[PDB]
Design a binder for these strands. Structure first.
Lengths: 48, 74, 137, 49, 97, 328, 146, 48, 216, 141
RNA sequence: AAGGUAAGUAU
């Protein structure tokens, strides 16, 4: 991810690459963010 | 120069021609009477039988829609 | 191709393998699996009759509102009516003499080369690291 | 250690000799807003000084 | 009074309206320019602005009762921005951890 | 019962129109600011193409719109616009279109700026477009002001300038102020000031960030000056002595959402000289007592401490809080 | 009297004052009458019926109309009961859950027809003999208060 | 919905016959009547 | 009364030829037949005025090729190209355009010129900053009178005696006045309390708004 | 709006979608007079030339061509739809409707990003592409 | 009421 900071990426390609850390943050706090108490509603299980 | 002219010949027309631009402008003016014309109707009205049968996108209705299209030929 | 009539007896959905989609059930006509066209007209005329209560008294007030609004803010086309009238004195040769618009800025501004981004030199990390080291006297 | 307005930290700063020749630094820091395109929340003070 | 060393006057401090408006606009431009931006960067900008304001005034905050509401509203806006980034549907009982 | 009937009389039209347009055979389904420009362009183009004898000259139609762009751009760029081959009626209508669009542009920019100042909830793209419009308007006003100053000469009468200069001369004579000399080639602090100046130029890059060409060029210049301090000092003194013409400096505007703060981008080569000059001037003006204590900030009191000292000075005045004899 | 009834008094006065203040004289009209143009066409007939019978007929007709609206796109995984509660017939998939969405207007119509069903069912219960006339009045009061 | 709810029988009535305008197909049925009442009589009845 | 102190001093008589311009979106044969229908023909209507309103040319809207940001100027006689049979003014209305060419009949002894500034555009009100180029000593309006009334009015020379000038934007602006001392012939400006002696030549280099002229 | 090519019947739309084999066909269903459609069409005209290499933009009048109203649910004032090799491409915009863009976008860069993402995903064979910007909120502050 | 549709081949 750090190697791609300078590889001539388009604006759309670079914008989506600046959201990679968030994908880790959500993973770090997944047991709490992904809860029934905090997100009321139906639940869908992953296909595998 | 050769490769600059080969690509130039193959280039398409991004925008409409003059006739299409003029016709589109007149069609737009025929509806926006708050800009053009004298009388002022609503934004989309042109002022101042047969209904075409169209497929609903369902595989179960392909045959009936096709036959209705065939049955509409005079 | 462009400017070509549609062949007779052609379904725009068919011949292309198109498939529709429904985001909800509240949008679009109900799915379908001469006593009808004479029954829709009855309800349409009924709706028009019910609208006839104030149709003349509200389509007249909106007319005066439109006239009042146009008194202060005229239509855009009328704001160029005199100039549009004066275009009749431009001859065909003069019309052909209209020049094509060019761009003043050169290649370096129109299509600049890619601006490479490079990391900050390591000396900046080093210098930030030097700060915070304090003399003992 | 961390008490005075010119924090006692600054007396032990490694670059305490070059900063003694830095004059008008608060005015310059305030006027930096006309050169950099980012507003400085600590426009009123300098960490080193 | 430096001569009598006695209580003579009393100074009441308050954050000026312009400073509050400047802080609010800074938080607004932090929030609105945060589309394709990491949560950490947004929180860092918010923390920097908040610490700058609070360490500049340090006494005028408590008397400016409007500033307290402004600060908590801005914090709620930042947290809502992060929550919307995590999921489009807002949570009901999001934790502060 | 009657309350729910009164609700019913009001809600009946909604349900009736929602149903009748739902189980019928045929189903039926930021524009304020992007309204007048588009309608004006469409109207002008329609009028021009209508009066155009396009039976032979259809291909000019797109060309016409291009003119309607460049003229507008030429108005937005505050540059002259005079197409030599353009017929006079066509040019007149294009000018009318540009005037109408410019009036709408100015009004929309001011209205959006007032909305943002009040606190209206707006988007980022709207903010950027509005900032661009205000930058163009402010620069046009600044061009007008500079032209007025050049044409109408200095606005300070000779008597006023003489009075100001005499007051300054008398003040300097009273304080016994020795003028700041040119930095000598053997200056005892010629290198410390250069290092201080280069540090300030590198403070903009203290936060780690991706460097573009201009930033890395400036850093290379700073590093070259640091590696050979004496060559840099010689170049600085040469610029101070002989350089009276300078390259253009770019201007942007920091949008604080309540006003616009101008931001100036100077060439790094001139930036080094200006930074060294600033450091030397402030060091000399602090060595001597050029600035009396009442000029702030004074590097010794942070603005909160300035307020504290000001309040203490108020309270410490002789009988300041007395109104027995009506003194105020 | 307690606090809540007093606040009820001020709020009722507030609504009365707002109605009496934001009141404009009715607009002139040509007096087109509905239920008069229905019977002009050959689509409606006139009779006289017990009000409970008409209520049952309207409840059934509204159920039929809502059922027709539910199976609009030939989707049969949403079931409307006779109490006008809309529920899936099974654990519907997420795509089918999206495909079976109705706007606030549909659910508002469903709930108003539910209120009419409640009223008509209370009257039917009274007519059968299950509940007393006083019980029917109290039930109607509870229906309109809750 | 509106026509029958306003023609609701009062607590002092067992059966309330109302005129009905019904669709020829059974699609819909309106209570083609307005509950006209004499106001002193109505108020006295509700007082009773 | 028909002849008060204001009518015989300031009021003059002017003739207007109001011709209705046909709508452009009409057939040429239909256009000419509408013109023949007497609906779109000139109608001479006499009138009386207390002052003559003078329209100014629109601002250049662009920098000049050589001298960038040149102040716009117009000679007075170009502004006074109005009120004659030769020239026409297409007055546009939200309903239809009209062709109204004017023709002076009786010149008042004291003629007031009101220069049209503070024009309300489609979005706000803006002042036309065009500098009026007029003489302050001698003019002649004999070319601005019809041949029938030229014999009646043997005098057509007017001298500027009073001038109003507006400084600043229409949102907030000051009104200065230059007055010609009839006894001495000198020009004095007075902005409220302030009174100064401006040279007569420097009078014409101002954004004039209202002027008063004397035929002597 | 009046500069972009126009398709006048359902067969022309069919051929336009079928003809392009290496470019994404961008079709705006709507009306020229609709203000939302004018904003969308002026943005498309602004980016029409820049996306020439990997996109072709057409305009279809739904009143004149109601041929796809039923299947594509073309009932919003404006609609932008992407096709690739005769295959409708869905975009995870975050608006709940992945099948189309049914609002006017102000910035011309966002539309370029959407077209670029659609082209990448479709050339990779995907039928759904996640947009670089989440449109569940207009980011108004 | 929603902003919670993996997409892809195969019949």
């Amino acid at each position: 991810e750090e190697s791609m900071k300078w590889k001539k990426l388009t604006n759309a390609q670079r914008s989506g690459l600046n959201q990679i850390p968030n994908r880790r943050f959500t993973l770090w706090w997944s047991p709490t963010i992904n809860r029934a108490n905090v997100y009321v509603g139906f639940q869908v299980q992953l296909d595998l | 120069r050769d490769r600059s002219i080969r690509e130039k010949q193959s280039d398409d027309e991004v925008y409409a021609p003059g006739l299409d631009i003029e016709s589109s402008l007149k069609q737009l003016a025929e509806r926006r009477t708050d800009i053009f014309g004298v009388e002022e109707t609503a934004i989309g009205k042109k002022i101042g039988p047969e209904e075409k049968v169209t497929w609903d996108g369902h595989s179960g209705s392909m045959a009936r829609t096709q036959q209705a299209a065939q049955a509409n030929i005079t | 191709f462009l400017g070509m009539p549609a062949p007779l007896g052609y379904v725009p959905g068919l011949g292309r393998g198109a498939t529709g989609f429904t985001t909800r059930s509240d949008i679009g006509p109900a799915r379908d699996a001469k006593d009808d066209e004479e029954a829709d007209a009855i309800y349409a005329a009924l709706d028009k009759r019910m609208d006839e209560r104030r149709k003349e008294r509200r389509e007249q007030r909106e007319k005066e509102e439109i006239e009042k609004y146009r008194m202060e803010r005229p239509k855009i086309q009328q704001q160029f009516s005199d100039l549009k009238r004066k275009l009749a004195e431009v001859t065909e040769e003069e019309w052909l003499s209209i020049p094509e618009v060019g761009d003043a800025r050169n290649k370096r501004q129109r299509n600049p080369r890619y601006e490479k981004l490079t990391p900050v030199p390591d000396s900046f990390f080093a210098k930030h690291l030097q700060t915070g080291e304090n003399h003992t006297s | 250690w961390d008490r005075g307005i010119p924090r006692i930290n600054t007396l032990f700063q490694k670059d305490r000799h070059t900063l003694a020749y830095d004059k008008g630094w608060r005015v310059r820091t305030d006027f930096k807003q006309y050169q950099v395109l980012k507003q400085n929340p600590f426009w009123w003070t300098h960490q080193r000084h | 009074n430096e001569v009598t060393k006695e209580r003579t006057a009393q100074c009441f401090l308050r954050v000026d309206d312009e400073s509050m408006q400047r802080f609010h606009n800074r938080v607004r431009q932090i929030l609105m320019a945060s589309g394709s931006t990491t949560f950490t960067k947004i929180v860092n900008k918010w923390n920097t602005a908040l610490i700058g304001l609070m360490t500049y005034f340090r006494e005028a905050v408590v008397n400016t009762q409007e500033l307290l509401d402004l600060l908590v509203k801005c914090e709620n806006k930042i947290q809502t921005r992060i929550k919307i980034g995590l999921n489009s549907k807002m949570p009901s009982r999001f934790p502060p951890v | 019962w009657r309350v729910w009937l009164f609700f019913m009389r009001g809600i009946t039209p909604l349900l009736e129109r929602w149903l009748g347009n739902l189980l019928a055979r045929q189903f039926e389904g930021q524009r304020v600011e992007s309204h007048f420009d588009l309608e004006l362009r469409a109207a002008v183009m329609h009028d021009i193409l209508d009066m155009m004898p396009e039976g032979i000259k259809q291909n000019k139609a797109r060309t016409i719109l291009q003119h309607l762009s460049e003229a507008w751009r030429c108005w937005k760029a505050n540059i002259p616009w005079k197409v030599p081959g353009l017929p006079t009626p066509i040019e007149n209508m294009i000018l009318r279109y540009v005037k109408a669009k410019a009036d709408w542009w100015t009004n929309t920019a001011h209205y959006n700026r007032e909305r943002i100042r009040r606190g209206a909830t707006v988007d980022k793209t709207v903010c950027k477009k509005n900032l661009g419009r205000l930058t163009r308007l402010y620069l046009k006003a600044e061009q007008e002001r500079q032209h007025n100053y050049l044409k109408d000469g200095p606005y300070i009468t000779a008597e006023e300038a003489v009075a100001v200069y005499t007051t300054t001369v008398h003040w300097l004579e009273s304080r016994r102020f020795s003028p700041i000399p040119f930095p000598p080639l053997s200056y005892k602090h010629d290198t410390k000031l250069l290092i201080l100046a280069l540090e300030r130029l590198k403070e903009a890059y203290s936060v780690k960030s991706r460097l573009n060409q201009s930033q890395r060029e400036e850093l290379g210049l700073i590093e070259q000056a640091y590696d050979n301090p004496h060559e840099a000092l010689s170049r600085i003194k040469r610029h101070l002595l002989t350089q009276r013409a300078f390259k253009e400096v770019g201007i942007e505007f920091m949008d604080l959402y309540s006003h616009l703060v101008p931001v100036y981008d100077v060439e790094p080569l001139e930036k080094i000289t200006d930074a060294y000059l600033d450091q030397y001037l402030w060091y000399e003006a602090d060595k001597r007592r050029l600035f009396p204590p009442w000029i702030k900030p004074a590097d010794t009191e942070p603005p909160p401490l300035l307020v504290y000292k000001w309040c203490q000075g108020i309270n410490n005045l002789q009988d300041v809080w007395e109104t027995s004899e009506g003194e105020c | 009297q307690p606090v809540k009834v007093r606040v009820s008094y001020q709020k009722l006065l507030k609504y009365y004052v707002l109605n009496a203040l934001k009141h404009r004289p009715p607009k002139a009209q040509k007096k087109r009458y509905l239920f008069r143009s229905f019977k002009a066409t050959k689509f409606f007939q006139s009779t006289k019926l017990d009000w409970v019978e008409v209520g049952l007929q309207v409840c059934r007709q509204g159920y039929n109309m809502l059922n027709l609206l539910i199976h609009r796109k030939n989707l049969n995984y949403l079931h409307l009961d006779y109490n006008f509660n809309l529920k899936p017939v099974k654990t519907l998939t997420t795509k089918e859950r999206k495909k079976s969405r109705f706007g606030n207007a549909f659910h508002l119509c469903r709930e108003v027809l539910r209120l009419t069903k409640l009223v008509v069912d209370s009257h039917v219960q009274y007519r059968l003999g299950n509940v007393d006339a006083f019980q029917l009045a109290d039930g109607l009061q509870y229906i309109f208060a809750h | 919905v509106l026509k029958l709810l306003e023609n609701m029988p009062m607590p002092w009535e067992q059966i309330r016959d109302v005129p009905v305008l019904y669709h020829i197909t059974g699609a819909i049925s309106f209570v083609n009547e307005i509950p006209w009442v004499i106001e002193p009589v109505y108020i006295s009845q509700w007082g009773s | 009364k028909k002849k008060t102190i204001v009518t015989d001093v300031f009021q003059g008589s002017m003739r207007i030829f109001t011709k209705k311009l046909p709508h452009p979106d009409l057939p040429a044969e239909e256009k000419e037949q509408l013109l023949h229908n007497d609906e779109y023909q000139e109608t001479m209507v006499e009138s009386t005025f207390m002052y003559l309103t003078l329209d100014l040319p629109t601002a250049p809207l662009y920098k000049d090729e050589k001298e960038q940001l040149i102040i716009p100027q117009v000679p007075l006689f170009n502004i006074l190209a109005k009120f004659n049979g030769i020239t026409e003014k297409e007055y546009k209305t939200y309903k239809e355009n009209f062709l109204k060419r004017f023709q002076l009949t009786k010149l008042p002894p004291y003629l007031i010129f009101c220069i049209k500034r503070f024009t309300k555009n489609n979005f706000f009100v803006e002042k036309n900053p065009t500098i009026v180029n007029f003489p302050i000593t001698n003019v002649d309006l004999r070319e601005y009178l019809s041949e029938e009334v030229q014999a009646v009015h043997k005098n057509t020379t007017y001298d500027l005696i009073a001038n109003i000038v507006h400084d600043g934007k229409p949102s907030e602006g000051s009104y200065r006045i230059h007055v010609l001392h009839h006894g001495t012939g000198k020009w004095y400006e007075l902005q409220d309390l302030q009174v100064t002696d401006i040279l007569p030549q420097m009078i014409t280099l101002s954004e004039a708004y209202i002027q008063i002229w004397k035929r002597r | 709006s009046y500069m972009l090519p126009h398709l006048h019947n359902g067969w022309q739309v069919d051929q336009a979608i079928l003809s392009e084999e290496d470019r994404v066909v961008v079709i705006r269903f709507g009306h020229d007079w609709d203000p939302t459609c004018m904003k969308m069409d002026e943005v498309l005209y602004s980016i029409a030339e820049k996306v020439k290499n990997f996109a072709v933009i057409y305009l279809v009048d739904i009143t004149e061509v109601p041929d796809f109203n039923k299947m594509y649910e073309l009932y919003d004032p404006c609609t932008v739809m992407f096709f690739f090799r005769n295959k409708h491409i869905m975009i995870d915009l975050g608006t709940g409707n992945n099948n189309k863009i049914n609002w006017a976008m102000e910035d011309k860069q966002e539309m370029v990003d959407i077209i670029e993402t659609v082209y990448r995903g479709a050339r990779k064979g995907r039928g759904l592409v996640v947009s670089p910007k989440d449109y569940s909120t207009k980011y108004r502050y």
